[PDB]
Design a protein around this ligand. Structure first.
Ligand SMILES: CO[C@H]1C[C@H]2C=C[C@H]3[C@H]4O[C@]2(/C(C)=C/[C@@H](C)[C@@H]([C@@H](C)O)OC1=O)[C@@H]3[C@H](O)[C@@H](C)[C@H]4OC(=O)c1ccc[nH]1
Ligand SMILES: [Zn+2]
Ligand SMILES: [Zn+2]
Ligand SMILES: [Zn+2]
Length: 1070
């Protein structure tokens, strides 16, 4: 009799329209001492999972419903239906005749199920624009355990009363009331202090009296506490796309839409309308628990097997067949024993079906010619896998362990992730759908969030319009660089305590000394941590043994009709649905293309299965550090390590991946491996006592602890641990729960003691392991990813030109990657030929010892334009001249834009016209010919300057191919430059000597030190080779204007030698 439950609230799932995050919201419900709360979002049930979980923990009853978007007529019909005369425009059916709101709440578990279904049918059958509409027809069929109200102002009853259609309003109420029932109909009354609500008040109370509808108070809250209303206003401007200054923008009137106290709400309503407040309590008593919806169940598909068999038996049979195929003349010793052990584990844990499903997917793919990758993650450690065809890496030779992948003692579920090539990953999703059902397979949702960089850009737009992007850019490009992907929080820039304060000085400078920047920043802080939009998970596919619609809410992406799921992946798996990960890889595609190029350019047919792992040529390449374009080995650091390591065998490759770990660089493990191997450093026993037990386990890695697998074996020998138990020890050591980690010492200590070890030795091993036990790599992953690295390297080493063509084709879109790769080709000696109209195809092509640029990779030119161009040439001649070109081409390819691009690229150079000439003539000529379609056009003799042509060519192609700037100026620099780049590289020059090098600048990189003062690093490449130059914070200020790519410069520097790297440190640029 003294409290109020709120039944109409909006969370942040009503995207860019609600502001109330669930944990803050439930904090307030507690402080105000209310029994229960409700959530009723706008045409979705996407946040039901988070809400149910949080309320149950914090002891509050959860009520879940939806605010539907109903349709004036049929859901299928997509014609706007206004209900009144033109003048009453702003008081009619909302969204210009599209929709009318309704409030629905789930009393029972049954009710919540029906509500999930109704929501799904709406996206499938009733989508108009961005609103998924139910209609009166749907709701009747699926209507048990739901409670409905006469609705907000934007609902039907109230819109009718506003326009004066009073009899019509009464008719609507009686319709909706019959659908649901006498007890499930309530009259909604809200007061916020405006007239539109007040005029109708008499109207509503009248209808209620006539039809005996009980009344209910609600407050339509979109935010938690009053101080926040300012923020709700900036949010609405993000959704609606209009500036704050603009008069006609959507807005709320006055800050009453918040979680009021019980006392506030009783005064406002208790005097005039008796019982509005008391009914809110009566509803809350009626709601029952929704636990059953969330109780976990077994819902994995069951694989069909031939007669006289079960899942177990068929697994055994398929394993046996696989062993024969791999080992034609008989399995080696012990292979049979490992298989039988593993099969029993899988069968005990009841996962036979899972393995068979994964196998079929790989087999179908192999038939169809889709490449599948060697292995990813932890799966390469199972023999059952290698036999079934899933994995192409043999467990037993390399020492990988089964317990890492599946642990006998623990209870969990296996996770296999599979890579398919980038282009044809799509077919796989479809095929899975075909095989298992269209109603049983779906993709999975992601919820996007606003972080620092996003919020700066939303704020600039709402304050300053579409012209605001330029300012937002300047601020965003002046933040300090990010540690993993995560970036400095917005609070951090201005708060002394936070660790990164020193780093952020530059941006703060602007905040304090510019009005506009300061205004953007203040709005931004409010817009952070809020959900912005829906998205779709990059790899996941959910599968079920039953129709998905009986378990979860679903939606259909409008563009392609794909089914997606309502809840996200942690949430789906919790109730027992199967997740599978199909990943895309682009390096798999490059491999396919280079094989095919050889078949045509030369005659060989190549099978990568039967290439030896010991090719001399591969290792010469890896050792010289020429690894641009090789999987995983691209970085500037990793190239230097490979130089020092000088690899000799496949084992050295598996290791280089795992030793550049975020720990090992600083924890200095990678310098050791290199030196121990090359006899510059001496192996060190951990302790004199323990040398001999642990000699073999650590011999491969020259005495260091590199792999997680090495750790599990150590525990076995010294402390006599079962490999299953050693597995638990690794995980616990990782998380560092101190109480457990303490207990861990007891077990380890006791075991080593019984074996007969000293107190001192026991202490030593523990001490060494803890540092090395958060930076230890999974060996299975490095073996699988090492193979792909080796294959890429072999193909580059034996067939140079054919490989580079496959590579350049894949990076057509990204013009920064293309620039890197095109310079590589030049140094290797390959000649890339300029694009051409008659002798080029869509993709780059290997023609003898050269490559011809692909037309599909010019800027602004698309697939469809080039497709048409080629057919014309096929059918109706070569293109003789520019005029002939204009005559023959169809309408689609006549665009002014396409034509100018090709002029600058050099596509018409063969035909013999000068480049500038075509450009000036192009505008008029296109029009004339296009007119006829719906000519001898003269070409002028003028040409752009060398520098400028190259600048423009770079724009369209990514780098210049026809010539190089230094060509033609190379001699000039030579006269003035005291020291050749080759000499200094060779080590001829004494350390710390003045020098005057000259060349072209490339790959300028911007860096900021701890105190925040910007500086730059660049490569001064000349005709042959280059030496790295560093311009320091002070240097960067005085001469910092000219440090931009592709500038011929003269640098005054100082020779600096360190750790086998020779570099220049410079002060003056002319
Ligand atoms: C969730 O975090 C990711 C980390 C990945 C991030 C960076 C690379 C990093 O580990 C990644 C990766 C995919 C790791 C796997 C262990 C995998 C687990 C779930 O199986 O994913 C992760 O752990 C990537 C790469 O494949 C391996 C070889 C690692 O690459 C390097 O460390 C590396 C350094 C230099 C070149 N490669
Ligand atoms: Zn709203
Ligand atoms: Zn509403
Ligand atoms: Zn509402």
């Amino acid at each position: 009799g003294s409290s109020f439950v709120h039944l109409h609230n909006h969370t942040e799932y009503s995207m860019l329209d609600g502001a109330a995050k669930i944990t803050p919201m439930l904090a307030e419900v507690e402080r105000l001492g209310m029994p229960a709360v409700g959530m009723t979002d706008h045409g979705n049930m996407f946040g039901a999972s988070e809400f149910y979980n949080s309320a149950t923990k914090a002891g509050i009853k959860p009520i879940i419903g939806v605010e539907a978007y109903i349709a004036p007529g049929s859901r299928f019909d997509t014609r706007r239906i206004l209900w009144g005369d033109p003048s009453q425009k702003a008081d009619d059916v909302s969204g210009s005749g599209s929709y009318t709101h309704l409030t629905m709440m789930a009393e029972n578990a049954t009710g919540l199920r029906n509500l999930f279904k109704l929501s799904s049918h709406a996206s499938f059958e009733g989508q108009l624009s961005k609103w998924s509409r139910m209609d009166a027809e749907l709701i009747a069929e699926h209507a048990e355990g739901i409670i409905i109200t006469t609705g907000c102002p934007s609902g039907e009853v109230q819109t009718r009363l506003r326009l004066g259609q009073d009899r019509e309003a009464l008719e609507a109420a009686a319709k909706w009331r019959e659908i649901v029932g006498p007890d499930n109909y309530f009259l909604e009354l809200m007061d916020h202090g405006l007239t539109i609500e007040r005029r109708v008040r008499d109207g509503l109370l009248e209808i209620g009296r006539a039809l005996n509808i009980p009344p209910l108070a609600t407050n339509d809250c979109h935010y938690v506490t009053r101080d926040a209303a300012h923020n709700h206003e900036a949010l609405l401007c993000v959704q609606t796309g209009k500036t704050l200054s603009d008069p006609n923008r959507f807005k709320f009137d006055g800050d009453g839409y918040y979680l009021k106290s019980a006392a506030e709400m009783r005064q406002i309503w208790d005097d005039e309308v008796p019982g509005a407040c008391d009914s809110t309590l009566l509803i809350a008593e009626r709601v029952q628990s929704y636990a059953d919806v969330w109780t976990p169940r077994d819902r994995m598909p069951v694989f069909p097997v031939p007669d006289g068999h079960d899942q177990a038996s068929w697994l055994r049979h398929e394993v046996d067949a696989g062993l024969r195929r791999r080992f034609p003349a008989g399995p080696p010793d012990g292979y049979r024993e490992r298989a039988a052990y593993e099969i029993d584990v899988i069968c005990s844990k009841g996962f036979p079906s899972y393995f068979l499903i994964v196998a079929d997917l790989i087999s179908y793919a192999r038939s169809a010619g889709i490449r599948v990758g060697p292995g990813r993650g932890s799966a390469a450690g199972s023999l059952v896998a290698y036999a079934l065809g899933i994995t192409d890496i043999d467990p037993i030779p390399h020492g990988l362990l089964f317990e890492r992948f599946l642990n006998p003692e623990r209870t969990s579920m296996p996770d296999i992730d599979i890579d398919f090539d980038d282009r044809r990953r799509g077919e796989m999703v479809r095929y899975a759908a075909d095989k298992w059902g269209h109603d049983r397979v779906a993709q999975v949702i992601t919820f996007g969030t606003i972080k620092t960089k996003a919020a700066l850009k939303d704020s600039a737009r709402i304050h300053y319009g579409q012209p605001g992007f330029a300012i937002a850019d300047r601020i965003t490009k002046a933040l300090p660089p990010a540690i993993m992907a995560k970036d400095i929080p917005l609070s951090g820039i201005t708060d002394p305590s936070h660790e990164r304060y020193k780093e952020a000085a530059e941006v703060r400078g602007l905040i304090e000394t510019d009005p506009d920047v300061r205004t953007i920043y203040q709005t931004a802080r409010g817009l952070e941590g809020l959900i912005r939009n829906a998205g779709v998970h990059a790899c996941a596919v959910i599968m079920s043994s039953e129709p998905l619609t009986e378990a979860i809410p679903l939606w259909k992406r409008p563009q392609d009709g794909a089914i997606i799921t309502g809840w996200d992946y942690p949430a789906c798996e919790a109730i027992g649905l199967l997740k599978m990960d199909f990943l895309g890889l682009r390096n798999l595609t490059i491999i396919g293309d280079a094989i095919d190029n050889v078949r045509a350019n030369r005659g060989i047919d190549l099978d990568l299965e039967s290439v030896p792992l010991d090719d001399k040529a591969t290792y010469e390449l890896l050792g010289r550090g020429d690894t641009l374009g090789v999987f995983q080995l691209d970085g500037g650091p990793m190239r230097d390590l490979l130089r020092r390591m000088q690899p000799t065998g496949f084992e050295d490759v598996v290791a280089v991946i795992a030793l550049y770990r975020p720990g090992p660089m600083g924890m200095n493990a990678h310098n050791d491996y290199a030196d121990r191997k090359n006899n510059r450093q001496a192996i060190k026993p951990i302790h004199p006592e323990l040398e001999e037990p642990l000699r073999e386990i650590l011999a491969e890695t020259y005495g260091l602890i590199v792999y997680q697998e090495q750790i599990m074996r150590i525990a076995q020998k010294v402390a006599s641990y079962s490999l299953a138990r050693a597995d638990i020890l690794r995980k616990a050591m990782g998380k560092k729960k101190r109480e457990v980690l303490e207990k861990e010492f007891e077990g380890f200590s006791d075991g080593m003691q019984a074996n007969g070890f000293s107190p001192a030795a026991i202490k030593a091993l523990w001490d060494t392991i803890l540092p090395f036990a958060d930076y230890a790599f999974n060996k299975s992953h490095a073996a699988g990813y090492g193979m792909v690295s080796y294959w890429t390297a072999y193909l580059k080493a034996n067939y140079p030109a054919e490989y580079m063509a496959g590579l350049l084709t894949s990076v057509g879109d990204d013009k920064d990657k293309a620039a890197v790769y095109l310079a590589d080709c030049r140094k290797l000696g390959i000649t890339v030929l300029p694009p051409d109209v008659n002798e080029s195809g869509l993709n780059f092509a290997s023609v003898g010892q050269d490559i011809r640029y692909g037309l599909g990779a010019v800027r602004n030119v698309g697939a469809n334009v080039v497709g048409s161009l080629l057919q014309t040439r096929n059918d109706k001649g070569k293109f003789t001249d520019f005029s002939d070109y204009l005559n023959k081409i169809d309408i689609s390819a006549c665009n002014k834009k396409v034509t100018e691009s090709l002029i600058k690229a050099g596509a018409f150079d063969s035909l013999g016209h000068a480049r500038k000439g075509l450009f000036l003539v192009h505008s008029d000529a296109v029009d004339s010919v296009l007119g006829t379609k719906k000519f001898t056009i003269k070409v002028p003799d003028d040409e752009w300057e060398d520098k400028h042509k190259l600048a423009l060519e770079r724009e369209m192609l990514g780098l210049y191919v026809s010539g190089h700037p230094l060509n033609g100026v190379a001699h000039l620099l030579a006269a003035q430059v005291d020291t050749a780049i080759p000499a200094i590289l060779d080590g001829d020059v004494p350390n710390d000597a003045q020098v005057r090098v000259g060349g072209i600048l490339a790959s300028v990189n911007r860096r900021v030190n701890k105190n925040g003062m910007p500086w730059a690093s660049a490569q001064l490449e000349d005709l042959t080779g280059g030496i790295e130059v560093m311009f320091f914070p002070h240097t960067y200020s005085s001469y910092g204007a000219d440090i931009v790519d592709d500038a011929v410069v003269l640098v005054n520097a100082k020779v600096a030698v360190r750790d086998d790297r020779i570099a220049l440190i410079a002060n003056d640029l002319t």
